[PDB]
Amino acid sequence: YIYQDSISLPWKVLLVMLLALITLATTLSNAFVIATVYRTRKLHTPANYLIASLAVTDLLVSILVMPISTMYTVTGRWTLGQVVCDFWLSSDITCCTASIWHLCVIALDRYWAITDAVEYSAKRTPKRAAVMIALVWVFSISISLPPFFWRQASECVVNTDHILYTVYSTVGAFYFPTLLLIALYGRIYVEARSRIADLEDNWETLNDNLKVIEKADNAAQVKDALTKMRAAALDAQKATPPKLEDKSPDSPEMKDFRHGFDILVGQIDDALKLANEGKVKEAQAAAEQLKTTRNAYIQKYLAARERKATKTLGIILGAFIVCWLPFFIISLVMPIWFHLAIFDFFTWLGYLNSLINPIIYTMSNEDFKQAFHKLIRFK
């Protein structure tokens, strides 16, 4: 029985048009993300390479799996033969597993960057990124390779004979990566929370000590509030969590919040020199410059407190669960309920995640956002 045989001609052609536009929108949205990393020299960093390889996996899903699926989902019958069926099922398992595992490799990279910044800076290289990507693909192909027990060769479905592999495939491909992502997001969320809580205190110490220099009575009072201000600025500079946007070291970092403390420290040192010279009135007058420099970084400070990197990783985590949790839940309860339409809906729900992810990055990451605005000639 095929439930699709009951669907009318107008609803069938509309369903083909909806599915074909999702497939096309996934291909172009991921093609944009790949080209943007490739074309922009500023984006040639291991972190953006992981975005670019996630976009490559999602592009293969849109070329090897989704077009050839639209017809099978709407008609409900396989007409391409056994050989094409073998490659289609395996490219569905391999690319979707690669898609899921790219997400935790991006999270692993963000976790190490926010949790172990000094030790990781030396290890975060494009060679490291390649080795991790190869491992993801080798693990992806290894998941789809065992159901080749088809010693027998209208219907095209993956081998459901061995319950032990069926659950290993579901765990290795989904349940293990989600538990890793929850743990990874948890540590990242808590890291950023304490990093902005420290940034808030160092910012307040900077503001209050800046008030003291103005209302100072002694030279020793001026000199002390300056060294305290000096220490808080460099502490605020380390407290500020990493941005969502990743740029290569060889790129001008103007109006950057972390740079504001560098020029500010330079000014605090210039003022302490006059204080050590004996020109305290001049050292006090240097606070008028410090006041304006601080005033120019308030907007960049208030921006840091919003933790865009963890916020957007939360939206990706959220988008990943809401897209794949129904599929892998039904995938486990199916051997042990409603019709085959809910399986077709939940497969496409997982497919949709290949489109949601590149639109989340290009709306959130300002490098990808400005690249898009350039593409459609919008200012």
Ligand X SMILES: CN1C[C@H](C(=O)N[C@]2(C)O[C@@]3(O)[C@@H]4CCCN4C(=O)[C@H](Cc4ccccc4)N3C2=O)C=C2c3cccc4[nH]cc(c34)C[C@H]21
Binding interface with ligand X (CB under 6 A): 92-93, 96-97, 156-158, 160, 169-170, 173, 327, 331, 334, 340, 343-344, 347, 350
The answer to whether the beta carbons of residues 70 and 19 sit under 8 Å apart is yes
Q: Which does 229 bind (CB under 5 to 8 A by kind): ligand X, ligand OLB, none?
A: none
Residue 92 binds: one of ligand X, ligand OLB, none (C-beta under 5 to 8 A by kind): ligand X
Tell me the C-alpha distance between 123 and 142, whole Å: 27
State the minimum distance, in angstroms, from the CB of residue 342 to ligand X.
Answer: 8
Minimum CB–partner distance for residue 117 and ligand X (Å): 33
Q: How many of the chain's residues bind ligand OLB (CB under 6 A)?
A: 6
Measured from the CB atom, is 297 or 346 closer to ligand OLB?
346
To the nearest whole angstrom, how small is the minimum distance from the Cβ of residue 58 to ligand OLB? 13
Report d(CA 360, CA 320) in Å as an integer.
Answer: 12
Among ligand X, ligand OLB, none, residue 62 binds (CB under 5-8 Å by kind) = none
Category of 76 on φ-ψ map: left (φ > 0), alpha (ψ -120 to 50) or beta: left
Q: Which does 356 bind (CB under 5 to 8 A by kind): ligand OLB, ligand X, none?
A: ligand OLB
Q: Of these, 285, 315, 321, 332, which contacts ligand OLB (CB under 6 A)?
A: 315
Quote the CA–CA distance of 85 and 66 in Å, as a whole number: 13
Looking at the Cβ atoms of 67 and 314, the one nearer to ligand OLB is 314
Task: Work out the angle at residue 60's Cα, subtended by the Cα atoms of residues 12 and 351, and round it to the nearest 5 degrees.
Answer: 45
Q: Which CB, 315 or 330, lies closer to ligand OLB?
A: 315
- Which of residues 301 and 328 has its CB atom nearest to ligand X in the complex? 328
State the Cα–Cα distance between residues 201 and 211, nearest whole angstrom: 15
Q: From the CB of 136, what's the least distance to ligand X, in Å?
A: 12
**Helical packing angle, 308-333 and 163-170, nearest 10°:** 170
Helices of type H across 40-80? 46-60, 67-75
Encoded tokens for 56: 């490559």
State which of positions 351-370 bind ligand OLB (CB under 6 A): 356, 359-360, 363-364
Smallest distance, ligand OLB to C-beta of residue 298, A:
22
Interaction between residue 349 and ligand OLB (CB under 6 A) = no
Residue 157 binding partner per list ligand OLB, ligand X, none, with a CB distance cut-off of 5 to 8 Å that depends on partner kind: ligand X
CB of 26 to ligand OLB, least distance (A): 10
Using only C-alpha atoms, the chain has a radius of gyration, in whole angstroms, of 27
The alpha-helical segments, DSSP class H, found in the chain are 9-39, 46-60, 67-75, 81-115, 117-121, 126-144, 163-170, 176-214, 219-239, 257-277, 280-285, 287-295, 298-304, 308-333, 341-364, 366-375
Q: Rounded to the nearest whole angstrom, what is the least distance from the CB of residue 138 to ligand X in the complex? A: 15
Q: Between residues 120 and 343, which has the closer beta carbon with respect to ligand X?
A: 343
- For residue 125, the minimal CB distance to ligand X (Å) is 29
Buried b (16+ CB within 10 A) or exposed e, 104-133: bbbbebbbbbbeeeeeeeeebeeeebeebb
- The residues that touch ligand OLB, with contacts defined as CB under 6 A, are 315, 356, 359-360, 363-364
